[PDB]
């Protein structure tokens, strides 16, 4: 609690002019300090459990030394909407791997439920996620169900502060292998979805890796990232909104603006 908040930041101007709700958790992993905003309260993933999925995927490759290269073919009825990647593999198949990437990187929805069957489902992902210690998050249906959002509703859902903790454990510590953590730390990298969120707030001289999510309903979409300032300990942060109304618009400058006052409330020069 001590290094909880220590510079209070404006997040409740910031939500209430984006007309919802902004759940915030940033780590400044050297000292311990925090910033903690509606961390506690549920939020959908929409696409961010993507990045789970695909450590899911790496832990499971660390027992199966083929998993990764292992080519998968899959029918035209498997590419649901916004499958940029698989689309282009329809014909020929793609790694797991592959899938993983795309997942990640290009939030693909076909590779994203390829994957998930891989692993047994929504309740084999949130099985990874227990194993780890995370006891908050929840998936529970399938790409593009899990994407409704419902007012209330804990289905497909995490808080900021679980996000956060798991990404950490999955990045920086052992929760993977050091090589299966490298390389999900360089899909996170090398997304193409999140130039306009968190690291619109990041110096360009800093390196960086997210994963988006976008509901498309409720006001719902997020990002979560990790943050190498250079010069000190990385910084591990979520931020997560939702709104009451099923038309009303996620903004992609809130998530930025959110993480800003974040990175201001760690001390963090940018
Ligand atoms: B997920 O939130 O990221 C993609 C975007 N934007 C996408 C598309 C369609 C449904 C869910 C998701």
Same mark, same amino acid.
């Given at each position: 609690?001590?290094?909880?908040?220590?510079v209070a930041?404006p997040?409740?101007?910031?939500?209430?002019?984006f007309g919802?709700?902004?759940?915030?958790?940033?780590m400044?992993?050297?000292?311990?300090?925090?910033?903690?905003?509606?961390?506690?309260?549920?939020?959908?993933?929409?696409?961010?459990?993507?990045?789970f999925?695909?450590?899911?995927?790496?832990? @499971?490759?660390?027992?199966?030394?083929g998993?990764?290269?292992?080519?998968?073919?899959?029918?035209?009825?498997?590419?649901?909407?916004?499958?940029?990647?698989?689309? *282009?593999?329809?014909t020929?198949?793609?790694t797991?791997?592959?899938?993983?990437?795309?997942?990640?990187?290009?939030?693909?929805?076909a590779?994203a439920?390829?994957?998930?069957?891989?692993?047994?489902?929504?309740?084999?992902?949130?099985?990874?996620?227990?194993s780890?210690?995370?006891?908050?998050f @929840?998936?529970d249906?399938?790409?593009?169900?899990?994407?409704?959002?419902?007012?209330?509703?804990?289905?497909?859902?995490?808080?900021?502060?679980?996000?956060?903790?798991?990404?950490?454990?999955?990045?920086?510590g052992?929760?993977?292998?050091?090589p299966?953590?490298?390389?999900?730390?360089?899909?996170? *990298?090398?997304?193409?979805?999140?130039?306009? @969120?968190?690291?619109?707030?990041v110096?360009?001289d800093?390196?960086?890796?997210?994963?988006?999510?976008?509901?498309?309903?409720?006001?719902?979409?997020?990002?979560?990232?990790?943050?190498?300032?250079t010069? @000190?300990?990385?910084?591990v942060?979520?931020?997560?909104?939702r709104?009451?109304?099923?038309?009303?618009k996620?903004?992609?400058?809130?998530?930025?603006?959110?993480?800003?006052?974040?990175?201001?409330?760690?001390?963090v020069?940018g």
């Amino acid at each position: 609690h001590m290094l909880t908040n220590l510079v209070a930041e404006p997040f409740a101007k910031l939500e209430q002019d984006f007309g919802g709700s902004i759940g915030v958790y940033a780590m400044d992993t050297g000292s311990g300090a925090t910033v903690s905003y509606r961390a506690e309260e549920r939020f959908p993933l929409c696409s961010s459990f993507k990045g789970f999925l695909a450590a899911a995927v790496l832990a @499971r490759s660390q027992q199966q030394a083929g998993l990764l290269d292992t080519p998968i073919r899959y029918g035209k009825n498997a590419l649901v909407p916004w499958s940029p990647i698989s689309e *282009k593999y329809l014909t020929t198949g793609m790694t797991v791997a592959e899938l993983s990437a795309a997942a990640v990187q290009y939030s693909d929805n076909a590779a994203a439920n390829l994957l998930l069957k891989e692993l047994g489902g929504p309740a084999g992902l949130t099985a990874f996620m227990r194993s780890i210690g995370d006891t908050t998050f @929840r998936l529970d249906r399938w790409e593009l169900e899990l994407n409704s959002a419902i007012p209330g509703d804990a289905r497909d859902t995490s808080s900021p502060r679980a996000v956060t903790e798991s990404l950490q454990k999955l990045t920086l510590g052992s929760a993977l292998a050091a090589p299966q953590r490298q390389q999900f730390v360089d899909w996170l *990298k090398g997304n193409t979805t999140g130039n306009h @969120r968190i690291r619109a707030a990041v110096p360009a001289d800093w390196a960086v890796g997210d994963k988006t999510g976008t509901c498309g309903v409720y006001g719902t979409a997020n990002d979560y990232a990790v943050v190498w300032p250079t010069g @000190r300990a990385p910084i591990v942060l979520a931020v997560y909104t939702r709104a009451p109304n099923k038309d009303d618009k996620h903004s992609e400058a809130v998530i930025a603006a959110a993480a800003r006052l974040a990175l201001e409330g760690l001390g963090v020069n940018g």
